[PDB]
Amino acid sequence: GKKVLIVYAHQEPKSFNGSLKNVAVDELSRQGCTVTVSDLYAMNFEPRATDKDITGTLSNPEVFNYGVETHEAYKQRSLASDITDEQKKVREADLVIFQFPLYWFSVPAILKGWMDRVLCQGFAFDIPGFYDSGLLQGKLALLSVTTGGTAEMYTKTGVNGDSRYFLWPLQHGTLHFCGFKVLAPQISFAPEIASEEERKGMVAAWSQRLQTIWKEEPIPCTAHWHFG
Amino acid sequence: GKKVLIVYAHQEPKSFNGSLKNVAVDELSRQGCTVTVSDLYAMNFEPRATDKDITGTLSNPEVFNYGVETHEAYKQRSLASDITDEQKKVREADLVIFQFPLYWFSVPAILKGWMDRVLCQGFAFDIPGFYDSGLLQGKLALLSVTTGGTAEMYTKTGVNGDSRYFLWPLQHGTLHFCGFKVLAPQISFAPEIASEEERKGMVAAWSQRLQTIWKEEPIPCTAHWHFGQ
Ligand SMILES: Cc1cc2nc3c(=O)[nH]c(=O)nc-3n(C[C@H](O)[C@H](O)[C@H](O)COP(=O)(O)OP(=O)(O)OC[C@H]3O[C@@H](n4cnc5c(N)ncnc54)[C@H](O)[C@@H]3O)c2cc1C
Numbered sequence: 001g002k003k004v005l006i007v008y009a010h011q012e013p014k015s016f017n018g019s020l021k022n023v024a025v026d027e028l029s030r031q032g033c034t035v036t037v038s039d040l041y042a043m044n045f046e047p048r049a050t051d052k053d054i055t056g057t058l059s060n061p062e063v064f065n066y067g068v069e070t071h072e073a074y075k076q077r078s079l080a081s082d083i084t085d086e087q088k089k090v091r092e093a094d095l096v097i098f099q100f101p102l103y104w105f106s107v108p109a110i111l112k113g114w115m116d117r118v119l120c121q122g123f124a125f126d127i128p129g130f131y132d133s134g135l136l137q138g139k140l141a142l143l144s145v146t147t148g149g150t151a152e153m154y155t156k157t158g159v160n161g162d163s164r165y166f167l168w169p170l171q172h173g174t175l176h177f178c179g180f181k182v183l184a185p186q187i188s189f190a191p192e193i194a195s196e197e198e199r200k201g202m203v204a205a206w207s208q209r210l211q212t213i214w215k216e217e218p219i220p221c222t223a224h225w226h227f228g
Numbered sequence: 229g230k231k232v233l234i235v236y237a238h239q240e241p242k243s244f245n246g247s248l249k250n251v252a253v254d255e256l257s258r259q260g261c262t263v264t265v266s267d268l269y270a271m272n273f274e275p276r277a278t279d280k281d282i283t284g285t286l287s288n289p290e291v292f293n294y295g296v297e298t299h300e301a302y303k304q305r306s307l308a309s310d311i312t313d314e315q316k317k318v319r320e321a322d323l324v325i326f327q328f329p330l331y332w333f334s335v336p337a338i339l340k341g342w343m344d345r346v347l348c349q350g351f352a353f354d355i356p357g358f359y360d361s362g363l364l365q366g367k368l369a370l371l372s373v374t375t376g377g378t379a380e381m382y383t384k385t386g387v388n389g390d391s392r393y394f395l396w397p398l399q400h401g402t403l404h405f406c407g408f409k410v411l412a413p414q415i416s417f418a419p420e421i422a423s424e425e426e427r428k429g430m431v432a433a434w435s436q437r438l439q440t441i442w443k444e445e446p447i448p449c450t451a452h453w454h455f456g457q
């Protein structure tokens with residue numbers, strides 16, 4: 001039995017992202033997996049890290065420290081319920097797939113806010129549980145990313161650089177740091193520019209990949225992997 | 229006479245970010261610069277890229293494409309007024325400083341959304357008209373970043389990898405894309421770890437640098453600079 005969380009960040013059901021999201025749901029559902037989707041925009045998911053993320057009265061309301069207050073709210077069970085709902089889905093999941101359009105060589109702010117607010121100290125990492133020992137060790141994470149720019153652009157000497165370069169903050173700084181093993185990213189280059197046939201072929205490739213997802217080994221999430 | 233915009237992202241005025249923001253204001257105001265701060269959290273700045281960002285008839289209301297719809301909105305002067313307001317600030321600034329704590333090797337979501345929403349096509353870039361031909365050419369940008377991780381952690385052979393690696397999406401993918409010339413980042417490592425006196429040093433060092441900021445030249449915002457040979 002396997003349990004997947006899809007964290008989906010696109011405003012339009014009929015987008016290329018929406019299609020990627022839906023074939024993941026359909027294939028993983030067809031395999032018999034437990035599937036849950038956090039459709040961030042439909043949820044009006046709050047992106048801002050603020051003192052409203054802590055219910056009750058703050059531990060030190062004089063000088064508001066987000067990292068400390070959230071750490072302490074997580075331990076005292078006083079986080080906002082939007083955050084705790086997300087944490088229960090992550091806790092239960094064996095795999096977390098992130099389905100998003102690349103925005104400024106990173107994730108859309110709404111998704112960034114999910115990272116920022118859900119992955120708090122005590123839940124996702126602690127001292128000493130980070131990187132290989134992060135608190136989510138034993139889970140898999142996969143970034144399924146679409147781009148505006150072409151694969152040629154995204155090379156070591158193309159105008160955008162190697163697509164691995166932009167993956168570092170997300171795969172290493174974020175997912176590795178919380179102890180996920182990182183599956184290889186799914187990158188779907190320039191759908192707006194591809195033909196009907198090319199776009200179908202990209203959806204197809206992803207569907208196929210999912211059939212064997214559970215067989216996969218994680219990448220070595222290293223500076224060498226991203227930059228070497 | 230120079231005009232600066234500081235885009236500032238921290239919830240707490242008494243924070244180390246707040247002190248950096250305020251020494252910047254102080255010093256730049258002392259020089260006689262014109263200074264504007266966007267205090268994002270204070271402003272309840274909207275981070276989410278949504279259809280609320282266009283006021284008029286969408287080009288294709290059946291299938292919402294944020295990039296397309298905002299570009300056209302920019303050209304029709306139909307963007308949400310919060311976006312327009314930031315754009316005017318940017319347009320008038322000679323220098324844009326981003327003041328923020330590192331969150332997940334990047335900017336805090338609220339600031340990410342300022343990037344996502346403010347830097348739309350037509351305003352910050354066209355196709356063609358990007359990177360060196362981006363539309364914000366002849367402006368300067370500077371990232372002033374604070375971190376939890378120590379400088380050592382942020383080396384090439386340490387757990388976080390080199391500081392420069394995490395700058396890439398911000399310096400190259402965003403700022404250089406839009407035409408900015410990028411000034412060398414100010415990175416204030418691990419204040420929470422530093423002593424009071426070490427913290428003071430870091431604040432004073434930023435103030436000292438600002439004294440001669442208009443004499444600086446930008447970095448070469450290339451793969452090489454960020455990643456080595
Ligand atoms: C703020 C912002 C910043 C950006 N920054 C970057 C950046 O740093 N780098 C970069 O490279 N790009 C950037 N982009 C562009 C962005 O990454 C792309 O626009 C996005 O990845 C495209 O995916 P989408 O799902 O919206 O495409 P869609 O526009 O939704 O897809 C293209 C076409 O595919 C069709 N389609 C949908 N489903 C299917 C299917 N099953 N079969 C066939 N066709 C299908 C759609 O109907 C549409 O015609 C940025 C965009 C924004 C808005």
Ligand SMILES: Cc1cc2nc3c(=O)[nH]c(=O)nc-3n(C[C@H](O)[C@H](O)[C@H](O)COP(=O)(O)OP(=O)(O)OC[C@H]3O[C@@H](n4cnc5c(N)ncnc54)[C@H](O)[C@@H]3O)c2cc1C
Nearest residue numbers: 067243244245247329330331332333374375376377427428
């Ligand atoms: C969601 C999240 C994700 C994070 N991700 C990362 C990450 O990827 N990488 C990473 O390295 N870190 C990360 N961090 C850590 C974060 O970057 C640091 O906590 C932040 O940079 C510290 O800056 P601050 O202004 O909040 O410091 P503060 O906590 O406000 O400052 C530290 C101390 O300086 C004192 N001080 C304030 N003003 C002065 C002054 N003028 N003179 C002397 N002392 C002064 C304050 O009183 C305080 O005691 C993350 C934090 C969060 C919440």
Ligand SMILES: Oc1ccc(/C=C/c2cc(O)cc(O)c2)cc1
Nearest residue numbers: 067119120121173174177376377
């Ligand atoms: O609420 C909180 C959420 C996240 C953090 C993250 C810290 C962090 C520190 C590093 O040195 C490297 C890193 O990749 C991440 C701290 C508080």
Ligand SMILES: Oc1ccc(/C=C/c2cc(O)cc(O)c2)cc1
Nearest residue numbers: 148149295347348349401402405
């Ligand atoms: O509203 C917007 C619409 C599109 C974009 C695109 C950005 C982009 C940025 C890059 O560094 C490389 C690239 O190939 C594309 C930005 C804002």
Ligand SMILES: [Zn+2]
Nearest residue numbers: 172176221222
């Ligand atoms: Zn890693």
Ligand SMILES: [Zn+2]
Nearest residue numbers: 400404449450
């Ligand atoms: Zn560059």
